[PDB]
Amino acid sequence: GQGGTHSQWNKPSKPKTNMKHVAGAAAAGAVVGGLGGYMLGSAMSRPLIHFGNDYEDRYYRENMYRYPNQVYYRPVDQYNNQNTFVHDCVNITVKQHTVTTTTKGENFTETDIKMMERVVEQMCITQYQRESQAYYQRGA
């Protein structure tokens, strides 16, 4: 024959454009050097403390707008009993209260400080149960 034709060419062209990177950070008021492993709990509906005395009852009612609505504690997996969870929770919460108060100046009378101890322990019992239920339902 006087000629002929043929064609062939490469199909691939240039490298794959797939790539990945990530960056980002955040901060929180946890991981205190003398703590290392505790977290913020959740708030709840207004826990109105009653003391039997109307005088004390009124004191709490007018000042509750200045009281903590949240508590802090170590996780459930570090406890074999409810009382230990409550003891950590009450201590860390009042600790947070005193360090900000002594640095910023006084904001409540001694009487108010005696009231807030009650609200913190009551919130600890309530939160402990919520955290425990969360641990059981997640299959921890």
φ and ψ at residue 40, rounded to 5 degrees? -75, 140
**Nearest Cα to 42, choosing from 105, 107, 131, 133?**
131
Rg (CA), the chain: 29
Method used to solve the structure = NMR
Tracing tokens 């290392």 back to the chain, one arrives at 36
The whole-angstrom separation of Cα 104 and Cα 49 is 26
The whole-angstrom separation of Cα 24 and Cα 137 is 31
Residue type at 31 in one-letter notation:
V
Return the half-sphere exposure (C-beta side, CA atoms, 13 A cut-off) of residue 35. 19
Q: Please, which contacts does 105-110 make with residues 24 or more away whose CB atoms are closer than 8 Å?
A: 107/66, 108/63, 108/66
Question: What torsion do the CA atoms of 111, 51, 55, 45 make, to the nearest 10 degrees?
Answer: 80
Structural domains in the chain, sorted by start: 39-137 (1.10.790.10)
**Nearest Cα to 126, choosing from 47, 60, 57, 66?**
47
Return the half-sphere exposure (C-beta side, CA atoms, 13 A cut-off) of residue 46. 8
What's the chain look like in SS3? CCCCCCCCCCCCCCCCCCCCCCCCCCCCCCCCCCCCCCEECCCCCCCCCCCCCHHHHHHHHHHHHHCCCCCEECCHHHCCCHHHHHHHHHHHHHHHHHHHHHHHCCCCCHHHHHHHHHHHHHHHHHHHHHHHHHHHHCCC
Residue type at 3 in one-letter notation:
G
Mention every residue, 6+ apart, whose C-beta is less than 8 A from residue 60. 48, 49, 51, 115, 119
